[PDB]
Amino acid sequence: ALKRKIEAAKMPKDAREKTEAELQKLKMMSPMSAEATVVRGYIDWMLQVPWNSRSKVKKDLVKAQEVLDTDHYGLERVKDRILEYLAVQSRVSKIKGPILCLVGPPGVGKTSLGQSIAKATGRQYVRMALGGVRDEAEIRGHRRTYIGSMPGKLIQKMAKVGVKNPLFLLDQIDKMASDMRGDPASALLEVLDPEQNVAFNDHYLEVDYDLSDVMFVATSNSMNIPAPLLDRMEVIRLSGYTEDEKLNIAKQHLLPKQFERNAIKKGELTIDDSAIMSIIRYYTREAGVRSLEREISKLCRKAVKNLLMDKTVKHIEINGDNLKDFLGVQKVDYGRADTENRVGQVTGLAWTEVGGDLLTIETACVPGKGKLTYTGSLGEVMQESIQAALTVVRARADKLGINPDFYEKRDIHVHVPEGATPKDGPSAGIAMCTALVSCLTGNPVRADVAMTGEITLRGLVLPIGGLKEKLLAAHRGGIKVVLIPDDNKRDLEEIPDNVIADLEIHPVKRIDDVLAIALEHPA
Amino acid sequence: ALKRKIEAAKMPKDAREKTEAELQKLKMMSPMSAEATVVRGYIDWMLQVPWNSRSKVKKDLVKAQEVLDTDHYGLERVKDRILEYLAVQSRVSKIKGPILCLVGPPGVGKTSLGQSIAKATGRQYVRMALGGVRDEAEIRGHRRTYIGSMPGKLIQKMAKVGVKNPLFLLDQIDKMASDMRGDPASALLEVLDPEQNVAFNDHYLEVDYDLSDVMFVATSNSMNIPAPLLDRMEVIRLSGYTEDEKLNIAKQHLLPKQFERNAIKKGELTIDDSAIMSIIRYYTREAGVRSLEREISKLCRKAVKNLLMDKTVKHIEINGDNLKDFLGVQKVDTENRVGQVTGLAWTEVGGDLLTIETACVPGKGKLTYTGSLGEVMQESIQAALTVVRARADKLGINPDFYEKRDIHVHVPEGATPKDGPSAGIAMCTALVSCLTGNPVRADVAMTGEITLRGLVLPIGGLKEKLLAAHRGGIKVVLIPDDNKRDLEEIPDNVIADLEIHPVKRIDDVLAIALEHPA
């Protein structure tokens, strides 16, 4: 009865020898006894686990890109990765299966992207959530000595799905526990090992199980992953969304499904680009699209109750002026450029994970005793950057037309007026220097100029990180000319075309180029 | 054996096949065993988890708004949200359960509001207090290999109700300890994500469970919730109450609730309006109504005791003057001062007034800050003093005041910590006033952040600051120019009583809030 199940679900060599040796051990037992229950539990756990069953992975690349574009918008690098997997899989009968780590801010669609991938490749879909998981026996299990023992949840999900080609979605791989009491992140170090998945030995089913064709896609919010795990995964960085692609996600994906979730017919509610872009500019302040679809869903349910409570107006048209009639007061406000050329203030470009933002930097240089105060919730690298900038102004103050004993006679206060927000990094340093020169000369910084870059005591401008959201923040803010470092010219290769067309972008190499461009008068 | 309860439960395919594989496995086991006890425990949990039971929800909106208006007063944004849900629900069959986050001060009415939503939408009610939840095993549970293994506490309350659509009141989300010793806030990410509510996957019940049909209303006292949870939750801000709102809540909702709590019949106890207003002004200073039903509960049980001691009288009348006969002493309670302003402060408890005092004596330039100040407020006084040093010859100060005067900025808070940029303009007003002898006119509060060029930047928590200024006797309130868009969310009596002045820079502030022209 059982040996036809063992021969039916055909195994490899060691699993068949272990299972038939286990049944031959069961043949000399009483049927209603504890060791018979442990042996029968090991046998039917060896029978539920798939050994040879697979799934026909798709081969058409055009229809696969049609599915990937049907579910999500943008995300070209991960879609390239899936189409390249389907090309190599179209040539080779069996390959190792990719191990991917999707890393990005929340709401950018990396959990639903997994089910999009499993639909577009034909592979079956398996999800396992690792958020806050502390027990390592969720992965490997326990020995069959223990009462009520069973394999790890990976083997349970493999036995549930029935095939040896699933897509595992490892949700929150960085929010796993890692201490002395619990470390499943080092238990995943065997199952994500790209060479040793051919023999995954867990604790209940002590045979070697092959996991060298399961596609692993892990989702995390940060690089706070142990360095052995990061080295075993292929990191794809999902950056935040811009205004145009939030407009396209809203028009192409969020509005039709929120119309579908609310029984809104085609001739009841209409939302144009003015309302969508007004939600993006004045209500969200996010990197994802989740509060965006919460605002859209709020518009839809308010439209529903306004179609039920009135029942004499049967078409509601939402646009740029009547959002406050539905959504209310604008929650946020983006930074804008200044209108007049003012002595002492510059506009650096700041970048957080929410996105880029303008960064006003102001300086007062009152006559005093050389006091140096720096306020505005500054970091320590930022304050070292202001000290370096002040040293560059101080060693160059004869050329700049500055009275060289200002370090004795004048008190300098660098302030960044957001106040409650902590701010750190050397990328404001060039900006700091410019502000100081203005506040030592009365030569006002022209307000249409933003800048970014790191300063050295020689006077040189060093590269910085994250130009794309800084330039999008300057384009949103109304800046017409920015100042990037020289060795970030390569990053200009991946900027959209309207941003390059609108911004007069000047790469700089040293500080007197910046003081030549960003000041109103010659220094 | 037990298949009558399995087919009697009408389970879905994976749960039915798994529990009948477990029961079929149980029959070939010998009884009186340990693992047979484990299997009977697991079947005993899966026979009492709701798989099909669904409560019929209410389609009527007028009866619904009648219910939420009969058991609460003026929580208009939340009651609007529930009418939105019940308006969408009449057009389709099933919706994902809305995931809400009620954020407000204590006593503002967030838990009883969950009882009101439960009684009004037709759903059943159970609450899970998240205060003190320190590990994921209270959400996902343990494997049945372990000895004391139960299916978390979500599935225990789903089984405790017995329906597929309850109203979980996830109470006190911000009271969770989510450090490295245990992070249950990361386990709620699967509970609150619509991408994965159709497969919850408890550790004890490894069958995928459907949480998409459960309405999630969660309560918090602040926005200090971790950011992957803030995205999955629609936050509704509930603000504090005025005095006439507290009078209407007390007179329309709290006094009847206390009368048939302490079995006071028709004509025994009578409390007028002035006694309630004297409890509001003289025995409370909160933003909620916790202490109102505390003091009213004291009045009711002292009334019942005074009716059982002395049966000569059959009616007790309380009129604002004999509150000393019941509560005893009261608990909590003008000229133009030089170097003293009253800024507005907004804690998580609510709004509060904020006295700010300076003293510029002849010294050598020291600069001392007292009053348990945060580092951002100290930087705000440094920025404010820099604004004063920048325009010294304009304002009429001798420009040697940085080296011939020394300045003490004290807030008479005492032992309460205070932090934020929002008092900054207040600082420099006092910094003008003590350096020129021009008295600050004492009916003026002010709020706003200091820019070194002299501008006034927006502040948050405007409504609670205006409510704190309305119960403090303030008449003129100086406001940043970019918060005037919030002025159409304020109660009309607050806008009617307070005189609001939106200002753009320091010269407007000194031109309004100083007595003599500068």
Binding site: A34, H142, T145, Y146, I147, S149 | A34, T145, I147
Partner: peptide
């Protein structure tokens, strides 16, 4: 009667 180790 038979002993059995639990975790």
């Amino acid at each position: 009667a038979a002993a059995a180790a639990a975790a």
